């Protein structure tokens, strides 16, 4: 039951307090938890994860 997710995230990278632009990322995963797993260790802060029904990437 894998699908595509829209990740609303802000760049942490890393410390130096500024107003950040909320960015978006489209990523394949098994679930929301799997998204967080895939992106842990990357210098970003996830605001919200959105499942995208009927969504696809180029090479599946």
**Which residues does 27 contact at the CB level (< 8 Å), separation at least 6?**
4, 5, 7, 35, 38, 39
Distance CA 45, CA 48 (A): 9
Distance CA 44, CA 15 (A): 11
Domain boundaries, the chain: 1-60
The tokens for 26 are: 């489209």
How far, in Å, are 13, 46, 49, 52, 53 from residue 20 at the CA level?
10, 12, 18, 25, 28
What phi, psi does 40 have (nearest 5°)?
A: -70, 140
Domain 1-60 fold is Ubiquitin-like (UB roll) (3.10.20)
Q: How many other β-carbons are positioned within 10 Å of the β-carbon of residue 24?
A: 11
Rg (alpha carbons) of the chain, rounded to whole number: 12
Give the determination technique. Answer: X-ray
């Amino acid at each position: 039951h894998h699908m595509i997710f829209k990740v609303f995230y802000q760049e942490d990278a890393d410390e130096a307090p500024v107003r950040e632009k909320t960015k978006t990322m489209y990523i394949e995963a098994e679930s929301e938890r799997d998204v967080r797993r895939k992106l842990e260790g990357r210098p970003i802060n996830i605001e919200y994860i959105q499942p995208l029904e009927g969504a696809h990437l180029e090479y599946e």
